[PDB]
Amino acid sequence: TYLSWRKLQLSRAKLKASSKTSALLSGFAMVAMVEVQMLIAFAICTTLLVAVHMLALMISTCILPNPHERLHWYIETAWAFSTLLGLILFLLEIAILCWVKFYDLSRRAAWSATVVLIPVMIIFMAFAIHFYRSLVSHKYEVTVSGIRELEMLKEQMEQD
Amino acid sequence: TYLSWRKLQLSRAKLKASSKTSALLSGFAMVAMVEVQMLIAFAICTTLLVAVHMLALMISTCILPNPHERLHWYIETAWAFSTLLGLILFLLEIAILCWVKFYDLSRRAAWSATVVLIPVMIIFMAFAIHFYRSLVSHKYEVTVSGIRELEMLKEQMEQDHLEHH
Amino acid sequence: TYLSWRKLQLSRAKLKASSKTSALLSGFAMVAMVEVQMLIAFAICTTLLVAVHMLALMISTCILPNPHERLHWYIETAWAFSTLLGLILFLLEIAILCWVKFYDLSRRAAWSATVVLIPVMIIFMAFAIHFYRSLVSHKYEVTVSGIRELEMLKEQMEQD
Amino acid sequence: TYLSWRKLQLSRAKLKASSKTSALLSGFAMVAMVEVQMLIAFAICTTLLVAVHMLALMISTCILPNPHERLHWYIETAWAFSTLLGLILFLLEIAILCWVKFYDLSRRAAWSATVVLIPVMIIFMAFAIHFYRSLVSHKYEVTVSGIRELEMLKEQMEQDHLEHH
Amino acid sequence: TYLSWRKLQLSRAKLKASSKTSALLSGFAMVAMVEVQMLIAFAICTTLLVAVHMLALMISTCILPNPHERLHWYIETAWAFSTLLGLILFLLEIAILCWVKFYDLSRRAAWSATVVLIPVMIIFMAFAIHFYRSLVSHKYEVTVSGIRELEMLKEQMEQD
Amino acid sequence: TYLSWRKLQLSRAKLKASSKTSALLSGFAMVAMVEVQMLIAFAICTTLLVAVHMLALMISTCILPNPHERLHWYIETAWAFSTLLGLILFLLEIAILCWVKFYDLSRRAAWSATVVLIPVMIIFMAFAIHFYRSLVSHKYEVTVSGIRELEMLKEQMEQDHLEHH
Ligand SMILES: [Ba+2]
Ligand SMILES: [Fe+3]
Ligand SMILES: [Fe+3]
Ligand SMILES: [Zn+2]
Ligand SMILES: [Zn+2]
Ligand SMILES: [Zn+2]
């Protein structure tokens, strides 16, 4: 009873927060684009960011009406994946914007920012891979996949 | 008990989230339009986007007061449909905006974006079709459904009034 | 017990959502007006939109402190009516804004938008009528009024 | 039990909504003022609007820690009053803004708007009066009410301390 | 049980509202500053306002993980104090902004606004004093301090 | 029961507030940057601020699905740390902005502000250090902790599968 209650309240706080954040990032970004008016990057990015976020929101239009377990995990993962694509794209978006604001101003600064982004993107790209892998395949293989990737790390910290 | 409780808390988190997002997308889009100030497209889009979202918000003004099941599902579906049209129109809106911001600047970028929208747009249009199909069909079933509930309400006041003497 | 609990949680999610949306639409609209600077329309509209929304919010300042049933339904309906007037006015506002942005630019587009608004406004005007009618009169007459208007529709779909 | 529960959940939804709206109207107004950059009116209004709203927010900083009943109603009423002044000032603010945006443009529009505000303004001023009247009256009753509660708190620490030995 | 439940739900609605408002005031203010571009005042103010608010938010990062009573009241009061400093600073900020918008325009108006602020600031300064006094000292002294300050008022209303 | 309930409602109010604030600070900062359009500082700051906040938001994408205790505390701490870095970077961001807005205008004001930041910055850096220290240490403990939980999950599917025959 406490487990089903916790699961349901987790989908309910995930609904309310996915909604507020996807909507807010999308809106702030649209405004950020109109306010300033590699550019193929800028457009494909803004447009992709809003598209991916709207996808997540719709997945919150449809989880409400809806064995059951496998379908709910595929939908859940599609929502999580769309959302992660949105956070990543919002980061790329601010990179491309430092780029556009500083283009004819200072190249050193722009390049510096876009560069300091790489290590975080790696962690970001890492998870994006897990959610994508989890989407095509079944829980087991990805569960064992995950134990392998973690155990091969357990050997590194000890050596040091 | 847990089922009716979960259903009611789902309509309550759907109310609170439909409201916050419909209002936020609409407001942000209106501001985005005034800030830059194929164009027939831009205007019809902004205006449709705000109209469809206001529709959703009103459906959240009216689900609160509310056999009942069929009527509640139709209203629910009209809400889901208005909302989905809003997400689509918001996406269309950012396309038209890349279009307008980049028009005399770079055609390659704008076109590239507007194109990369297609695979996602398919999924959006797909669902929009299902939600539309559910509405047109039950236009019949529900109107009646609503008559039966309003009648039962006219009847519950007649019984509740027959005891006042 | 479940009924009184559901009624109370409905007034509580209606309070929280009326508040967030009335405030957000009002603020976004005020900003939309200052950012661009038939115009009598534009001013009367912006001003009416903010006034009607503030009305709803105040009705949320006063439902909190407060036979009881009839008074609560009149207040409820006044809140719903103020809110609906706000959604309508927000739509009119975006119409008038396409109008103002495109005036000396393209008349075809502006007129096109303001036109595509009519069928939705009808549905909007329709409900605005119900809430107004519900305000002056008592539940019964409007309940029967509603059964008549719906039954006269039951005859149309069958014929086709 | 249901009554005390409902009262407490009403102060909790009133806290969460007072906060979101007071903060949002204030922020939006400040931005609206800087964006355009009878004028003594414009400044006194913006400044009063933000001040009154910050007042409300602080009253939400202090209802959280809190005989008790009379004190809680006075504080509640000060919150409702600050909030209502904020709604009024926000309305006044958009009037003065139609005024300023349209000043050298069209006087007819600005005046028309500012006029159409009157019937609604009456209802706002009406309630503002009631909330004001409740405050001035109990300035007496409550101060004392608060002394009795703070004393009982000074006394509950003295009893709670008499047992430590 | 009802008391511990109410206390916990009060810290939970205080968390959610401190967060939304501190974040919103800080963001709106940052934007208000960039949009317009005694000035030492303007900068020290904007900067202090954002700093004090971020302080409150962090205190909401750390109340979540955490005899217990005395520590929780010191943290609580530090949060309340940071928050109050934020509301005050937001008011000062709008004063300084009327000041900056009207400087070369109309001095009468600016001075008028900044002046009408004083009586509210007094009430604001008053509470800021209570929360600060409550921070260095223990509950008792400030409780009695508070009974003295209130009783000396009970003598004024009667005389009139 | 009350303890596990309180813990779960604390992660739920922390989820909802981390989300609203991380998203709002990030969006507001991006807009603040485009609106004005030592500068290497300005760019690295804005970009770091948005990156660290997006990190926090994602940690709220993943705490929802989730021995378990140690893993949940590490994830919790990574969230608290990303969030705190965001508050710091937002503060740094408004400093750099006083700097940039006032650069060719008044150096006294900008410098004054940027200086008055120091005592608060200390408290922020202080906590940032503790949260960092907790992470580096348990890099060991947790990885293992997560292996034990994922294994137990691989084992609970093997038992749940041994009964299907
Ligand atoms: Ba501008
Ligand atoms: Fe809630
Ligand atoms: Fe909320
Ligand atoms: Zn009779
Ligand atoms: Zn003693
Ligand atoms: Zn087998």
UniProtKB/Swiss-Prot annotation, chains A, C, E:
The record marks E35 as: Confers selective permeability to Ca(2+) ions. The chain crosses the membrane at residues 21-37, 39-59, 80-100, 109-129. Changing V31A: Constitutively permeable to Ca(2+) ions in the absence of Stim. Residues 101-108 are extracellular. It is found in: Cell membrane. Belongs to the Orai family. In Greek mythology, the 'Orai' are the keepers of the gates of heaven: Eunomia (order or harmony), Dike (justice) and Eirene (peace). Hexamer. Pore-forming subunit of inward rectifying Ca(2+) release-activated Ca(2+) (CRAC) channels. Assembles in hexameric CRAC channels that mediate Ca(2+) influx upon depletion of endoplasmic reticulum Ca(2+) store and channel activation by Ca(2+) sensor Stim, a process known as store-operated Ca(2+) entry (SOCE). Regulates transcription factor NFAT nuclear import. This is Calcium release-activated calcium channel protein 1. It comes from Drosophila melanogaster. The chain holds residues 144 to 329 of 351 of the full protein.
